[PDB]
Amino acid sequence: MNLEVLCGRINVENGLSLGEPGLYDQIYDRPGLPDLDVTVDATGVTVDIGAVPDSASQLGSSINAGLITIQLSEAYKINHDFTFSGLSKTTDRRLSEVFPITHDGSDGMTPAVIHTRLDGTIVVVEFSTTRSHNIGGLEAAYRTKIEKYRDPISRRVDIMENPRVFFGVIVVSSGGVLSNMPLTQDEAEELMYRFCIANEIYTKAREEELEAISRALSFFSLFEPNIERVEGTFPNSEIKMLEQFLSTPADVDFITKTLKAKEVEAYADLCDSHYLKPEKTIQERLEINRCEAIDKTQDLLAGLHARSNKQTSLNRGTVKLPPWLPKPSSESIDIKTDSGFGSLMDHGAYGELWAKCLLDVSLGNVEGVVSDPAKELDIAISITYRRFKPALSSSARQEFSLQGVEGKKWKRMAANQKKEKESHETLSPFLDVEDIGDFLTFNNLLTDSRYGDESIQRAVSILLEKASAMQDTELTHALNDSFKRNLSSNVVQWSLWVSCLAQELASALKQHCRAGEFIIKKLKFWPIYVIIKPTKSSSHIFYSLGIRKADVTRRLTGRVFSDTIDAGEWELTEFKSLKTCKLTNLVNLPCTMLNSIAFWREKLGVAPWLVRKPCSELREQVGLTFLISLEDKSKTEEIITLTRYTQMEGFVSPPMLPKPQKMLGKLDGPLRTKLQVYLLRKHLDCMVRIASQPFSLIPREGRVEWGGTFHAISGRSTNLENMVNSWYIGYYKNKEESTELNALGEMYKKIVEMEEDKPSSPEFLGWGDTDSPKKHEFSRSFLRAACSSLEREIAQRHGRQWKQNLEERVLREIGTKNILDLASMKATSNFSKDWELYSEVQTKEYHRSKLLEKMATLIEKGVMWYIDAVGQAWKAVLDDGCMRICLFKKNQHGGLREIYVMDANARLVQFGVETMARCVCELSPHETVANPRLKNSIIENHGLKSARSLGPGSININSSNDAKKWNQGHYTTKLALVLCWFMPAKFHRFIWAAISMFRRKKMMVDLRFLAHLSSKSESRSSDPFREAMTDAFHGNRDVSWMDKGRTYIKTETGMMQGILHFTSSLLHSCVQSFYKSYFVSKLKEGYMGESISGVVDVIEGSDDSAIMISIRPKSDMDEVRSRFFVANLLHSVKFLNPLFGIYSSEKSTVNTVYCVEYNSEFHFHRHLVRPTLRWIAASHQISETEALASRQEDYSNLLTQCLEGGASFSLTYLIQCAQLLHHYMLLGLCLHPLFGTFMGMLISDPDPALGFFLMDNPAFAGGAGFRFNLWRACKTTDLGRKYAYYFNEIQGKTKGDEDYRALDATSGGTLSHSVMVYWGDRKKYQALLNRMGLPEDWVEQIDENPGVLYRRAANKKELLLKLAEKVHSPGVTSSLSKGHVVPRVVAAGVYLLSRHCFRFSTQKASLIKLLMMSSISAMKHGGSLNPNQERMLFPQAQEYDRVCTLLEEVEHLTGKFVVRERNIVRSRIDLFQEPVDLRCKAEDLVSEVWFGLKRTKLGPRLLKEEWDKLRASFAWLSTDPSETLRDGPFLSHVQFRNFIAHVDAKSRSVRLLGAPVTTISQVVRMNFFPGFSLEAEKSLDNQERLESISILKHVLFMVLNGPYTEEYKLEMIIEAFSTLVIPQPSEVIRKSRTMTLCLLSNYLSSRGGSILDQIERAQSGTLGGFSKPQKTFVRPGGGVGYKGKGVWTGVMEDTHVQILIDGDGTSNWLEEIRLSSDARLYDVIESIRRLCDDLGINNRVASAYRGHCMVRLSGFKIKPASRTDGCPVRIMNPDEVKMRVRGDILNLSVTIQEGRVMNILSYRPRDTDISESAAAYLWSNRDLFSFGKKEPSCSWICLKTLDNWAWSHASVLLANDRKTQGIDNRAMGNIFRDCLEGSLRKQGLMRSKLTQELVDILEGSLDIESIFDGAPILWSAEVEEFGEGVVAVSYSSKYYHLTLMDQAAITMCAIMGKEGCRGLLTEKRCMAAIREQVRPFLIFLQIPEDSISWV
RNA sequence: ACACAGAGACGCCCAG
RNA sequence: CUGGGCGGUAAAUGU
RNA sequence: AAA
Ligand SMILES: [Mg+2]
DSSP states (O other): OOSHHHHHTOOOOSBOOOOOOEEEOOOSOOOOOOOEEEEEOSSOEEEEEOOOOOOTTOTTOSSOSEEEEEOSGGGTTHHHHHHTOSSOOOSOOOHHHHSOOOOSSOSSOOOSEEEEOTTSOEEEEEEEEOOOOSHHHHHHHHHHHHHHHHHHHHHHHTTSSSOBEEEEEEEEOSSOEEESSOOOHHHHHHHHHHHHHHHHHHHHHOOHHHHHHHHHHHHHHHOOOOHHHHHHHSTTOOHHHHHHHHHSOOOHHHHHHHHHHHHHHHHHHHHHHTTOSSOOOHHHHHHHHHHHHHHHHHHHHHHHHHTSOOOSSOOOOSBOSOOEEOOOOOSOOOOOOSSOTHHHHBTBHHHHHHHHHHHHHHSSOOBTTBOOHHHHHHHHHOOOOEEEOOOOOHHHHHHHHHHTTTTTTTOSSHHHHHHHHHHSOOOOSOSOOOHHHHHHHSOOTTSOOSOTTSHHHHHHHHHHHHHTTSOOSHHHHHHHHHHHHHHSSHHHHHHHHHHHHHHHHHHTTSOOOOTTOEEEEEOSSSOOEEEEEEOOSSSOEEEEEEEOSSSOOEEOOOSOBOOOEEETTEEEOOOEEEOSTTHHHHHTHHHHHHHHHHHHHHHTTOOTTOOOOOOHHHHHHHHHHHHHHHHOOHHHHHHHHTHHHHHGGGGBOTTSOOOGGGGHHHHOSOOOSHHHHHHHHHHHHHHHHHHHOOOEEEOOSSOOEEEOOBOSSSOOBOOHHHHHHHTTGGGOSOSOOOOOTTSSHHHHHHHHHHHHSOOSOGGGTTTSOOSSOOSSOOOHHHHHHHHHHHHHHHHHHSOSOHHHHHHHHHHHHHHSOBHHHHOSSOEEOOOOGGGSBSSSSTTSOOOOEEHHHHHHHHHHHTOOBGGGSHHHHHHHHHHHOSOEEEEEEEOOSSSOEEEEEEOHHHHHHHHHHHHHHHHHHTTOSSBOSSOTTGGGTTTTTHHHHHHHHTOSSOEEEEEEEOBSOSSSSOOHHHHHHHHHHTSOSSSHHHHHHHHHTTSSOEEEOOHHHHHHHHHOOOOOOSSHHHHHHHHHHHTSSOOSSOOTTBSEEEOOSOOOTTTTHHHHHHHHHHHHHHHHHHHHHHHHSOTTSOOOOEEEEEEEOSSOEEEEEEEOOSSSHHHHHHHHHHHHHHHTHHHHSTTTTOOBOTTOEEEESSEEESSSOEEETTEEEOOOHHHHTTSOOOOOOSSHHHHHHHHHHHHHHHHHTTOOHHHHHHHHHHHHHHHHHHTTTTTOTTHHHHHHHHTTSOOTTTTOOOOOOSSSOSSSOHHHHHHHHHHHSTHHHHHHHHHHHHHTSSOOOTTTOOOOEETTTEEOOEEEOOOTTHHHHHHHHHHHTOOSOHHHHHHHOGGGGGSOOOSHHHHHHHHHHHHTOTTHHHHTTOSOHHHHHHHHTTSSSSSSOEEEOOOOBOHHHHHHHHHTTGGGTOOOOOHHHHHHHOTTHHHHHHHHHHHTTOOSOOOOBOOOOOOBEEOOEEESOOOSSOOSOHHHHHHHHHHOOOOSOOOHHHHHHHHHHHHHHOTTOOSSHHHHHHHTTOSOHHHHHHHHHHSSOOOEEEOOEESOOOHHHHHHHHTTBTTBOOOOOOOHHHHHHHOHHHHHHHHHHHHHSSSOOHHHHHHHHHHHHHHSOOOOOOOOSSOOHHHHHHHHHHHHHTOSSOHHHHHHHHTTSEEEEEEEOOOEEEETTEEEEEOEEEEEEEEESSOEEEEEEEEOSSOEEEEEEEESOOSOOHHHHHHHHHHHHHHTOBSOSOOOOOSOOSOEEETTEEEOTTSOOSEEOOBOOGGGOOOEEETTEEEOBOOSSTTSOOBOOOBOOOSSOOOHHHHHHHHHTTTTSGGGSSSSTTTTTTTOOOOHHHHHHHHHHHHSOOOOTTTOSSSHHHHHHHHHHHHHHHHSSSOOOOOOOHHHHOOOOSOOTTTTTTSOOSTTTOOOOOSHHHHHHHTOOTTTTOOTTHHHHHHHHHHHOHHHHHHHHHHOEEOHHHHHHHHHHHHHTTOOTTTSEEO
16 A cells, blocks of 8 residues: 555644554455465575455455565564565664664664655654454554654653644554554555465564664564475485484493403503513613614604705705995995906806996996985976896807796797706705804804995984984983994895885886896985896896905905905906795894894893803804704795694603604605705704603703703703703794795695595494494594583583573574675685686686675675575575585795685675684683683693692693694584584474585686696606696596696585684594593592592683593602503594594694693793794884875784793884884885985974874883873974864864864874875775776765764665775775785885875875975964873873883883892783773763663763863764765765774783783882893882872771771771872772772861762762672682662662672672652663673573552663563652761661661771882881870881891780780781781792592503602602682782791791791791790790690 | 795797 | 797694 | 672
């Protein structure tokens, strides 16, 4: 029907109305039904509509014969949208548009139809249907639909002017129609007919949260893929296997037999492999092992030498660059031919070429060789190369073509063929690697060059001193001098000119040249000339070097450098080649060398400010780093990398021997470089040395240390940290390198090798159990047992209802997904049927498209929910029959990895399974890849459990594991069985089909690879894979994985890398749970039927795993038997691992005592080591961005990540200096002639996002972010004037200057003005935009409806707009193109200074022009920032000021060297936290004001107040969104939203590692340099005026927690508050102790008057507390949880509220709300939500009260009173207050009535708020307060130690009870004893005070004593536990920071004896002559003298 | 020179 | 043998 | 007293 006539026949009067319900009934007779054929599939449901039966009543004319399609998701609401088909205009609007904003929370609610009438009236009609036959049901539905809408519509119309609205509702059932809408009878009859058809079709076919749940549930209920088609298509995809796996139980007898067999096999391997039997001495055993290792190394060397040329002596250079080190000079080109050019030609073809090259340059035309500054200066304020063609004689061309400059044309002749045949040769191990050996130990790299006076050093020093102007202390000068000394060196200058050469080559990389011509160019500073012959930009580029040979002042020593040809006066070099990938390391060379020098000098103990000769060890590390960076080969990295695995075996304890000869499987391979031969020889020597003897464990007092550590490459013995960091030297290589076509055959070899052996019989692939499986089989019963064990664990931890919660979570996570979430920049494959066959796509080019294009078509098709697009993708995959995969290579710091790109439909299908697997993995207590908090929890908390259960002196045993081929080896049926086991039986079909689609993998190959492959039919070659591939492609031989003439490789086994990550993690978790259950079951038993006591902890990731087991022995013999038993248990795992599909790798290290590694984190007892070299190396991998500020912020992020790995602040400062040098070099330092003018002009105006580089304070360098440095710069230098002018123009006070104003604010609090234009990907990005076809006027459409940038959005055009603004994002879309960032940045930096390439935020101007415009600019504004502007711009400026004022306490380099702290743990230092007074968020405030949706929890009155404050800040703001755009200085709402969202405070948390732990002062004193203390010098006058409240908190803590009576405490509090001055309170909504202190001071001073008004104003109208408190529940080590039934009573916005709460165990919940007066309720709701989330209680728990009330409240959302859940909302003097002090609690208690206590404020001092600076401030004012009179005060009130006579007087006070004013007895003694005990434990002596069996789920031949002889005994060592759980317990004492008894213990230890004290605390023994002196300390210990027994 | 237990690049398209 | 015109790829799953 |  129509709506126009229906709305026209409605008369609307002024106001609101509801009409009267008109009950309608059927009148005309009804025909039966048209034909309604309905079928269901994955696409949808098809509704075939037949012909309506004919009748005279014209019923059925609305329908039309045909077919109707409905998607599966919305099949639940079929009656509603088919009975009411039509009659709706769609484009559903909300109440926010036509009605104004009321801020009631009901704005998000929208009706079905909303009609703006032709005369302006508003009519809203609501539809409702029901399958009932009673009139009462229709009346109930009508009343419900009336009442759920009447109240909010009334509230909306009782405010808007001239309201004329009408509300209607239509209820249609199968028995009648009830509606207030006047309708004709025929309309009712046709609606009845449509309802009958709708419910017939439904019977035949059968809040946003609830809608998503219903949609997902309906989809999974109606989804039915044909199982038979899957079984006919995919192998081993029968549901019978799944049903059998879920049906039959396990066979326990088979499990027992298999366990016994594998146990005896493991025992046999352990006994025979490690030479256990017969009896032998340990020395004999290690000698036999060493002989075996020597034999294996020798036969490997012989086998490697067999397939090689002999070639004992060979001439080659590992470094291609010459060792020249010339002095820098000016940029003046000088030929200066003195001996004549004639002496050059008669020295070879190189001499002829160089003579002919220099002769042309001698004949004028010097332009092009050196840039002209004049031309650049006149062009900028308003790339020419010197090409030449020499003679090129034929012999010269031949000799040059030998090097490969023109190798294609000169390929035929015999010399080039000989060279090509010789190139394919592998060098021999016996090559006499001699020069490399003595180059490392003896080199002159670290000798000072005495060059620190030239122009480059002058420029960098000028820039450094300009950057360090803000911080002008002595420390900065010392660190700058150290950096300059590092800069002045031979290696650094060599790297500088090498990097200049590399930048020049990268600039000249893309310059096409004709045949026979070259380019000559001179470097800017050094007198070095290069001749460049460039080929294609992707291909090689050639160069030769020439020097005067009279200007080479210095030269590096060593023979590793390549030979240089001498030609008379000039020295020349041959033609070498590089690519784009190899230029990365050459550019970043000087920064790399500076970082390495600083890092190793700091690590070797040399202080930065000292000057010493270099050590022998230092030169080895720096030379090795230099050689590795220069050679840049992939094979060289592996040898150094495997040193970690071959060296980790030295920690293995008895009875296992260290066997590093397992690593020979990867050391084999070709050796094409001399350096690789040297590294292999040193690796074998280290292997032999490791196999000879293990590492020595020395159990000293308490601590555990390892001895005999040494460096792998050079046999020098070092510390442990040096070895761990030397394990990672191989990371000094370019991670990304290009792949050539003769390569890439290794990938296909890795793919096909596993697939060759697949068991043909499928009986052991899930069908049945078997022992001793093959390379792919597994046992079903073991999987059943593991799944049952993990299910038992989950049911134990997460209760018995975990399955239903998991189902609801899965449905919620899958129901809310849109297509726009899936769209991203990730690539996808276009491989299809037409690409399969060759010889038809040979003359075509294959390309990969982004997922954005594939999702844009789906979005514009008309689907938005992800749950709608799964069916089409699944059907398309099933029809195609195979998953289609593309391949490429990802190069990493390790072995090569194959990466699988995936099709779009396959990705869409895989997303849901990945989501389900993640949801299942979120519950496991062992898995860590989805629970990142667990990896730092399981390892650290093992010590606590070991100490708590077993007791003190436990012995730990650990094992670290890995997997050979995790991606391969896994048959997908196992994963499917596990997932279906862990699911509630409704997802089973979908998971089974989505897994079964995997086993038809078809992987493409490169088309050029096949194009070169098809030409050749004979393979030759020495490897079988090439012959097999050639014969299979040509069809000569037949293989299963590839057929004739196809472009795809077909496999059947394995899962790809990462595609099924979470499912593999779940399987690994099941296996580890089974292992733990088996281990504890066997640990219950013991040797000879004993009972070994211990604890087993297990942790795992994707493939990595770790087992930690600790036991406690009582004697020696049982200790040795227990350790042998544990060795057996840890050795059986590698034989239990063939069961399932694990196949544990060779890199696993087993049976180590006090060490365990997991995810590259090494725990060595209480010393935690993290390799920081891997982060220091990666400190220059910046990303391409639109602005320079983003480059600086990326530098800051990399520096922070480097600091978090663990490094001193001096090292961080030096790394920041290196980053500054790198940035300034990237900004055209050595590529543009006008950089000197640029810096000389820039030093006047330092400006971030303009060219200047800000630098941090040396004391605190990495913790502070970029905003802190911006704030310091704005408050220190002239940047504040420009920022003030910019912000004033933003305010609108200063108008004009349309193009001068800055609007775009980059993330990080940096508003920007300009952006560079020239992007290489910009044309590609434009093409990408063209091929998707977005609307052009997206900004015009987004300004019309701005409410889509703040909501989820539902309209299709809304989604198109959101996608359009997603593509046009400034950062992500333009930056994720990626590539080799550094070479392209270098190439663009040759013209960035002087060329029009910057765009305003349309004239394009140079950087110098931008500097001139900024000169005629805000520099003339001359105004500073006011506190309002600073508070708006920096929302955390107070924390910045506090940190800065604390920071300047350290300004001088004075300190003492101390012993290094040997207890390293992690920490979480919180700083720069979110402000408490801000009370709101800008974006949330704007969203709530403009669109009325609940973002912030602020009431409408507070919203009005904050809006008035913001309007005071910004004048052009207004409630109407459209008014703000034109009035304000903004172009579009996108820019406004970006500007608003960018400037908002974010909390900054650092995670330092070091000694356990103001705290900033402690971490800046300890971590400045290891073994050194910074020793800050404080100023007295600062802390009293900066934070006087901290002194008050200190005094309050030391008074309340102290030995004082209550009256004395009251008087002390009164006088302390009277003496100090406290600022006035600030209004906050979050509870704070500072505000309570201010209120307490104002109350006791009585200055504010009515204290209740002040309290309610400070807490924003909130008053009250607990009338009946809640009884406490003792918590296991924490504050007592308040449980029971209680009441919260108070006032809130002039309303007498009363809240009833209840809780049980975990949290409290709302029970009942009683309120005095309704008035406005919404402010009450927001206030009570703030109270609830401040006190931690929840609203989700349902209430049992079913009685009558006014409204319901559930989940902090208002609900109609008809519904039954949620909390009911039923409506029901300053002289009385006083001071009351409880135990460590202050309260302003004021009882409401007699019989109960009513307190309204709280304050408990803690252990944090104690400062030594506050104690010193109290010491200066010792006579001011009353505490200076007696001895307990001035020592307990202040913080100081106790003197000898002082503690003697204290002891004689202790001996007698006496009576002293407010001093007390027996409690002062308690705190004294606690302080003395804590002081005792710090120095030593006194020790710090501190299951899923398998059954319910289901000898003595060795000498032992001899095989464990010669080993230390560990139970007699008394070694402590490790982990942060133990460490944090020892600091739990409240009086930890007390020095009141340290000197007492120092004096007592000497007089008593180190062993004597321990005997005293155990046996109570002492001798009399020292008893006379320890008797005062015996009364301090409160131990009687008659009890202690004398010796 | 680069890559590789010899699968490739060492310019490509034209026009005469 | 000359002469003219140039543009690529590179990017996978998760927190 | 605390999340
Ligand atoms: Mg592995």
